[PDB]
Amino acid sequence: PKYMQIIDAAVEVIAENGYHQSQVSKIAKQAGVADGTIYLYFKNKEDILISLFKEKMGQFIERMEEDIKEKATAKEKLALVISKHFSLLAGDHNLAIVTQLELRQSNLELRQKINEILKGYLNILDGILTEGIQSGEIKEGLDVRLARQMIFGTIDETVTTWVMNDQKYDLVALSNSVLELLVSGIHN
Amino acid sequence: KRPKYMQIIDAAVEVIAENGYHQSQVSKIAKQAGVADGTIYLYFKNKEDILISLFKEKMGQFIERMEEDIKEKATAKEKLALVISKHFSLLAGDHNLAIVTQLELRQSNLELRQKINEILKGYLNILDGILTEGIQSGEIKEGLDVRLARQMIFGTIDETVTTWVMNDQKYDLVALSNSVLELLVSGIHN
Ligand SMILES: CCCCCCCCCCCCCCCCCC(=O)SCCNC(=O)CCNC(=O)[C@H](O)C(C)(C)COP(=O)(O)OP(=O)(O)OC[C@H]1O[C@@H](n2cnc3c(N)ncnc32)[C@H](O)[C@@H]1OP(=O)(O)O
Ligand SMILES: CCCCCCCCCCCCCCCCCC(=O)SCCNC(=O)CCNC(=O)[C@H](O)C(C)(C)COP(=O)(O)OP(=O)(O)OC[C@H]1O[C@@H](n2cnc3c(N)ncnc32)[C@H](O)[C@@H]1OP(=O)(O)O
Numbered sequence: 001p002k003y004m005q006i007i008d009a010a011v012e013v014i015a016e017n018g019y020h021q022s023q024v025s026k027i028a029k030q031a032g033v034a035d036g037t038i039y040l041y042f043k044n045k046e047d048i049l050i051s052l053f054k055e056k057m058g059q060f061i062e063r064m065e066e067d068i069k070e071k072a073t074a075k076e077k078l079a080l081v082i083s084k085h086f087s088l089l090a091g092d093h094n095l096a097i098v099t100q101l102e103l104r105q106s107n108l109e110l111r112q113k114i115n116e117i118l119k120g121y122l123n124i125l126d127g128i129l130t131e132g133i134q135s136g137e138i139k140e141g142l143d144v145r146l147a148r149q150m151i152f153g154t155i156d157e158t159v160t161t162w163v164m165n166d167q168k169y170d171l172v173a174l175s176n177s178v179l180e181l182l183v184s185g186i187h188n
Numbered sequence: 189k190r191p192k193y194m195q196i197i198d199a200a201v202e203v204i205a206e207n208g209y210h211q212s213q214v215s216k217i218a219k220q221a222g223v224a225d226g227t228i229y230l231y232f233k234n235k236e237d238i239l240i241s242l243f244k245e246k247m248g249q250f251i252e253r254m255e256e257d258i259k260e261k262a263t264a265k266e267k268l269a270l271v272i273s274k275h276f277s278l279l280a281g282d283h284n285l286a287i288v289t290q291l292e293l294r295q296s297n298l299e300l301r302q303k304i305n306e307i308l309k310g311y312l313n314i315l316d317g318i319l320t321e322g323i324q325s326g327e328i329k330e331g332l333d334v335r336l337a338r339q340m341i342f343g344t345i346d347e348t349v350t351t352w353v354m355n356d357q358k359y360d361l362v363a364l365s366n367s368v369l370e371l372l373v374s375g376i377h378n
Binding site: 112138142 | 264265291294296298301327328329333343345347367376378
């Protein structure tokens with residue numbers, strides 16, 4: 001529909017120009033819709049940014065949630081999380097620019113709305129960690145919140161570095177090396 | 189004169205933290221420092237010059253102090269323990285600093301970001317030094333991807349701070365130093 005056409009054109013425009021520099025009129029023209037047609041679907045530019053993130057994250061979570069059911073151990077569940085995270089962003093370079101640079105807004109009001117959407121993804125990491133402790137696979141007395149922040153922070157930094165290096169190298173191929181580091185640490 | 193230069197730097201930290209980088213005009217920084225707009229322009233080209241120099245100055249001082257301190261530590265674990273505790277302590281000691289590092293320095297403009305990341309190299313090279321020495325010591329096992337390990341360490345420390353800033357500093361960040369250390373050292377597996 002026209003809705004997804006605007007969403008996709010927004011991903012391209014925001015990635016290319018930056019969020020604040022982006023023009024709603026330009027997003028419309030690239031989507032192939034009239035200027036007024038965008039406002040039938042979105043309140044403003046902020047609504048566009050939040051909705052595209054909510055949408056894509058919403059798709060990513062529901063795929064992830066059912067996919068990790070097939071995997072028994074916490075290590076296997078985390079392996080899939082990392083490879084899927086890396087795979088989605090490697091498949092479309094515009095997406096990585098949005099996630100690593102453009103969604104990193106400093107305005108408290110806007111950033112809280114962004115981080116609210118992030119919560120669903122981090123919740124999956126929490127579940128993997130809590131059930132891992134239950135089985136005795138994951139360290140007992142380990143802080144789930146801190147481990148969640150290590151896992152996400154590590155994955156995120158790997159992506160950011162890749163983005164800053166013009167995405168010239170294979171991000172997906174780093175999946176297993178990242179997993180082992182998070183599993184056994186630097187001492188190993 | 190450097191004292192005036194650094195006075196502007198310190199005034200800018202407060203302004204950028206309290207106002208946000210977008211609303212951090214030269215005139216506001218001037219008013220904070222208690223100097224005329226012209227005085228600022230004798231030391232800096234513009235708002236962007238101040239932000240980069242701000243980061244260069246404070247990171248430089250952090251690195252120098254860090255290089256100094258870790259000389260007293262023996263193992264890579266102890267060296268990393270110190271890096272983590274000092275990183276947390278600096279940002280916990282002045283919340284204005286943490287706002288600048290976790291939010292305000294996170295610029296979307298690729299050209300500005302590249303200049304910021306250039307200053308970040310010196311910090312990451314200390315982590316590289318700790319790891320490469322650790323491999324050549326037997327403390328860290330062979331075949332460790334240094335780059336990825338560095339990215340893991342910084343990413344973990346950085347995300348822990350950001351979460352703390354986003355939760356309005358409502359917990360003891362420095363007290364988490366050892367827990368973060370053990371997670372990086374031993375991982376999540378039992
Ligand atoms: C208030 C005042 C401030 C107080 C400050 C004092 C307090 C200090 C503590 C606070 C610190 C917090 C920092 C503040 C915020 C900074 C900005 C952020 O957002 S930070 C958070 C976000 N993070 C960031 O923004 C940091 C993102 N990272 C970077 O931008 C860069 O890694 C770099 C510039 C940091 C280093 O660059 P470089 O020296 O070049 O090293 P590279 O490894 O990148 O590249 C080497 C070559 O190898 C290739 N290669 C690399 N990796 C891999 C791999 N895994 N597999 C295969 N290949 C790989 C690569 O293609 C390249 O190839 P080529 O070019 O030779 O062909
Ligand atoms: C466009 C395409 C999209 C692609 C599709 C997506 C799939 C692939 C992409 C992957 C996603 C990439 C993300 C891209 C978006 C960029 C956004 C970033 O900047 S991300 C990079 C930067 N990262 C960020 O910006 C994320 C920063 N984190 C946060 O802002 C939050 O953790 C949260 C909102 C995520 C969750 O919040 P919440 O659910 O509230 O859970 P909390 O634990 O935080 O709070 C619970 C309570 O516990 C307290 N407490 C916490 N720790 C401790 C402790 N150690 N001791 C004692 N107490 C502690 C705390 O004070 C709080 O107090 P209260 O509530 O009782 O008063």
